[PDB]
Amino acid sequence: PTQFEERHLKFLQQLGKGNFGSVEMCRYDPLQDNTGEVVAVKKLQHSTEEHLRDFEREIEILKSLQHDNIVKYKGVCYSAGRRNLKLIMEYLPYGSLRDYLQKHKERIDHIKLLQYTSQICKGMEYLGTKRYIHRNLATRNILVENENRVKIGDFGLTKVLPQDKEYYKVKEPGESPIFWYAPESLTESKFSVASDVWSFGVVLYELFTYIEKSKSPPAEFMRMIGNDKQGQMIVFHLIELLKNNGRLPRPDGCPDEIYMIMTECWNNNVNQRPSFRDLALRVDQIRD
């Protein structure tokens, strides 16, 4: 059931749009009926040949993944009479963990936060087994299936390690989520499981802020660097702050033991950052 016909793939709702991609909720009814299944469809926006090649790689990555905490691949639609490509995924009703945390604060306490943490770690452990580097871990990129299950959604930025190295060097990017980046990613464009672990620390910070507006990583880092500055000088200041131990603060209400996990992920010493496997084991112990 891996190939979906464009004639039966009906638009329902916008789910998230960027400069280079869009995801929509759609209904797939091939028995032309109503019983058809609801899916999520990712398509490029402002597509180029190079972006299409990248998208094919992103599709093959998601298809290669089978895990409870990773959005389920369903197939591809070769749309415009088989002259274009769209990616078909399962549909997750509850949106992004960022939006969910903000809307449903009153049924989320600390143990629930840590249940999400743990599930994120486990998806990340699984990604590690395929030598994939996510490069974009953020609560906006984590999806909520139900109150008991979250899933890493979006592999737009994901790279596969060379078979002979432990790091991937990106030259290209331009625009990047700099406030979630490890310092060597900012300085050297080097990406690794260790840099994913750094980003994971920032995700843990996001959770314990419960998405209160002025507590976001960009809001905080810009407070710290000076919310006056503009263009490159922002990145200059961020690198300098990080290299010399400026860090996000402990959120209000966050236990020491949980902030400590964050600060250990935020190690400038790449080789001393914890593994996703020891993070899962730690978090699971704090949860009991």
| Count of residues in the chain | 288
Q: Tell me whether residue 42 or residue 159 sits nearer to ligand O19 (CB atom).
A: 42
Structure tokens at 149: 């299950």
Q: Tell me whether residue 18 or residue 249 sits nearer to ligand O19 (CB atom).
A: 18
Pick the piece of the chain touching ligand O19 (CB under 6 A) from 87-95, 105-113, 192-200, 238-246.
Answer: 87-95
Structure tokens at 25: 């909720």
- Find tokens 């936060």 and name the residue: 113
Region 99-118 residues binding ligand O19, contact defined as CB under 6 A: 99
d(Cα 208, Cα 85) in Å, to the nearest integer? 38
Q: Which of 93, 91, 89, 66 is nearest to 76 (CA)?
A: 89
Determine whether 263 is exposed, middle or buried from the number of CB atoms within 10 Å of its CB (0-12, 13-18, 19+).
middle
To ligand O19, the closest distance from the beta carbon of 202 in angstroms equals 17
Determine whether 102 is exposed, middle or buried from the number of CB atoms within 10 Å of its CB (0-12, 13-18, 19+).
middle
Rounded alpha-carbon distances, angstroms, from residue 86 to 1, 67, 187, 258: 15, 22, 34, 40
Q: Tell me whether residue 36 or residue 156 sits nearer to ligand O19 (CB atom).
A: 156
Among 8, 12, 16, 210, binds ligand O19 (CB under 6 A): 16
Pick the piece of the chain touching ligand O19 (CB under 6 A) from 14-22, 77-85, 167-175, 208-216.
Answer: 14-22
Among 4, 28, 91, 179, binds ligand O19 (CB under 6 A): 91
| Contact present, 16 and 22 (Cβ < 8 Å) | yes
Binding mask 135-174 for ligand O19 (x = CB under 6 A): --------x---------xx-x------------------
Structure tokens at 204: 């843990």
Region 41-80 residues binding ligand O19, contact defined as CB under 6 A: 42, 71
Pick the piece of the chain touching ligand O19 (CB under 6 A) from 91-99, 164-172, 217-225, 238-246.
Answer: 91-99
Residues that bind ligand O19 (CB under 6 A): 15-18, 21-23, 40, 42, 71, 89, 91-92, 95-96, 99, 143, 153-154, 156
